[PDB]
Amino acid sequence: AHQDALPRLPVPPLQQSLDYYLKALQPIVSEEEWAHTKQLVDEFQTSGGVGERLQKGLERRAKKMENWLSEWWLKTAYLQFRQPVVIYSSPGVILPKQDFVDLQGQLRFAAKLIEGVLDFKSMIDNETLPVEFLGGQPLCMNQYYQILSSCRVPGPKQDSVVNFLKSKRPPTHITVVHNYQFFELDVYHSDGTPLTSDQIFVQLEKIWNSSLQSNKEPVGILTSNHRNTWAKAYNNLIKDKVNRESVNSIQKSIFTVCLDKQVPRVSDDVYRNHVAGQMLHGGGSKFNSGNRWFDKTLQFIVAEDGSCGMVYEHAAAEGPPIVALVDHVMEYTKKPELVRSPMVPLPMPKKLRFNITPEIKNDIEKAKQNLSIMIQDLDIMMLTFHHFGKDFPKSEKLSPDAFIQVALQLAYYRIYGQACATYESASLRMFHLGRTDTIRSASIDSLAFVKGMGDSTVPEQQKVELLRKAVQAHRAYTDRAIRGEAFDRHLLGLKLQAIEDLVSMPDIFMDTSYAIAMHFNLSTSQVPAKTDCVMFFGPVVPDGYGICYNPMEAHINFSVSAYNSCAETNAARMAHYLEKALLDMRTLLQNHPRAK
Ligand SMILES: C[N+](C)(C)C[C@H](O)CC(=O)O
């Protein structure tokens, strides 16, 4: 019912979107390229022209679909993306490290975590999940019904997603992975009531005792290979009815809990970078990468040393829904303990065995090698910005997110001497089934600021004005994006409509400017959470960075990724300039108060 009250995703006017496109191109293309693109744009949208016909097609699409973009986005952004989901697609999460130092503790926490999720699942199944608002406007809650009991399934041409949340007989079990071995653990009684952390611990107890050794092949590492490869290996792996039975149990499970094995202690100054690696990819074949199933939508990882976190498959959802679950859970794991009545000799969790063959074993070794290369090429720098958080920008009446994005443009320019196409996730949840759109952080105003900031001929009195104008511009772009007025998904739609209409690919899309515009050297997102956590992901281009952050009141958690194969990029350096950019902006604003 709530969804029927939500407005439908609009199709922006053609002229509106193209005008914003031309403006966003100015700081990243040459004068000559911009001029040429201006011509193509005028032609493209002329009355009775090509663009007008494609626009009408989109308007017809919105009239005959719940959300004109949904299917196209899911397919284009994820299902047709054939690179491994590991690092390149599935975001990782680091949660507040826990205190436990022994096995019974780890299982105790793991057990508490499970109960927390089920508590959250209650509102989902019962549809009692509080209605969220952005500011007087209702938000789509569909993403919350895609994360549990779901899984990505390899496809020879494109992948697919399975969701058992609303099936005839919905799954009532989760999968636990310990020492590369999977187990099927039911978390509900025949009566319907879910198990308690105690009963669950008793179950987790039996599971650990039934997997005390690690000498099995890491079948799960197969899910980390190229999708074309995993598609073939998967198809084979499931020929054996036992394997197919296990794989099926995994895909149906409410979610996967990974009880990771102890790993080598590292120096404190690189500890977080390592924990990030463990959450994003596992660390390698001889660590915890095999203790996974990357096709799974929600994977909660409870490490040995007390660290904890997760990694989720992106086709299934976005960050916000994930953090809402994380916040609810991390809080639940802190609640008191009273009624601890004695359970019963609960049934034992079924083990998900795998019959390995020379062919399957070979694919496992091919996967280990592929992942090994991927991990060695990833450069990650985790940065805890302790200087300030949302507090400072708020004290200047500036949007913290906009302040942060402008700082990143400053950091990038200080390193490369030029701006670059920049992507920032914008939530389209105020619309039915809305996912995301793109906020472009490289703008006419941000370029003017970063240039003025380093120009010794520009007085500080002027620099600050340029700073304020850049932040307000980003905030404006952000407000338009969230209200369906950005242009990136729109242009994508026009291109896909052309493909569907069987008409020659419009020149505007073959244009050099468009190519430059869609090559994001900076791919970013803000994932706010009450929980002091942080997410991270790999760059979207060879020569780019993947930056994610969670601004807290007095500090900001940042993650910076880059590829070693590209000499021009360095996570540590980008992180350093970012910290300094943020500091210099504070100094400049402090030096020139609007009043007094
Ligand atoms: C990670 N990144 C920014 C590439 C993708 C976002 O997580 C989702 C989106 O913006 O569609």
From Swiss-Prot:
Source organism per UniProt: Mus musculus
Sites bearing N6-acetyllysine, chain numbering: 232, 239
Record keywords: Acetylation, Acyltransferase, Endoplasmic reticulum, Fatty acid metabolism, Lipid metabolism, Membrane, Mitochondrion, Mitochondrion inner membrane, Peroxisome, Transferase, Transport
Similarity section: Belongs to the carnitine/choline acetyltransferase family.
Keyword Ribonucleoprotein: no
Reported impact of residue 535 to G: Lowers activity towards short-chain fatty acids. Strong increase in activity towards medium chain fatty acids
GO molecular function: acyl-CoA oxidase activity; carnitine O-acetyltransferase activity; carnitine O-octanoyltransferase activity
One Pfam family this sequence matches: Carn_acyltransf
Catalytic activity: (R)-carnitine + acetyl-CoA = O-acetyl-(R)-carnitine + CoA; propanoyl-CoA + (R)-carnitine = O-propanoyl-(R)-carnitine + CoA; butanoyl-CoA + (R)-carnitine = O-butanoyl-(R)-carnitine + CoA; hexanoyl-CoA + (R)-carnitine = O-hexanoyl-(R)-carnitine + CoA
EC number: 2.3.1.137, 2.3.1.7
Subcellular location: Endoplasmic reticulum; Peroxisome; Mitochondrion inner membrane
Membrane-topology descriptor: Peripheral membrane protein
Domain of life, source organism: Eukaryota
PROSITE patterns, per the entry: ACYLTRANSF_C_1, ACYLTRANSF_C_2
Role this protein plays: Catalyzes the reversible transfer of acyl groups from carnitine to coenzyme A (CoA) and regulates the acyl-CoA/CoA ratio. Also plays a crucial role in the transport of fatty acids for beta-oxidation. Responsible for the synthesis of short- and branched-chain acylcarnitines. Active towards some branched-chain amino acid oxidation pathway (BCAAO) intermediates. Trans-2-enoyl-CoAs and 2-methylacyl-CoAs are poor substrates.
Top class in the EC scheme: transferase
Protein name: Carnitine O-acetyltransferase
UniProt short sequence motif Microbody targeting signal, positions renumbered to this chain: 595-596
Cellular-component GO terms for this entry: endoplasmic reticulum; mitochondrial inner membrane; mitochondrion; peroxisome
Impact upon substituting residue 536 to A: Increases activity towards short-chain fatty acids
InterPro entries according to UniProt: Carn_acyl_trans, CAT-like_dom_sf, Cho/carn_acyl_trans, Cho/carn_acyl_trans_2
Residues that bind (R)-carnitine: 423, 425, 436
GO terms, biological process: carnitine metabolic process, CoA-linked; fatty acid beta-oxidation using acyl-CoA oxidase; medium-chain fatty acid metabolic process; short-chain fatty acid metabolic process
Active site: 314 (proton acceptor)
PANTHER family for the chain: CARNITINE O-ACETYLTRANSFERASE, CARNITINE O-ACYLTRANSFERASE
Complex and partners: Monomer.
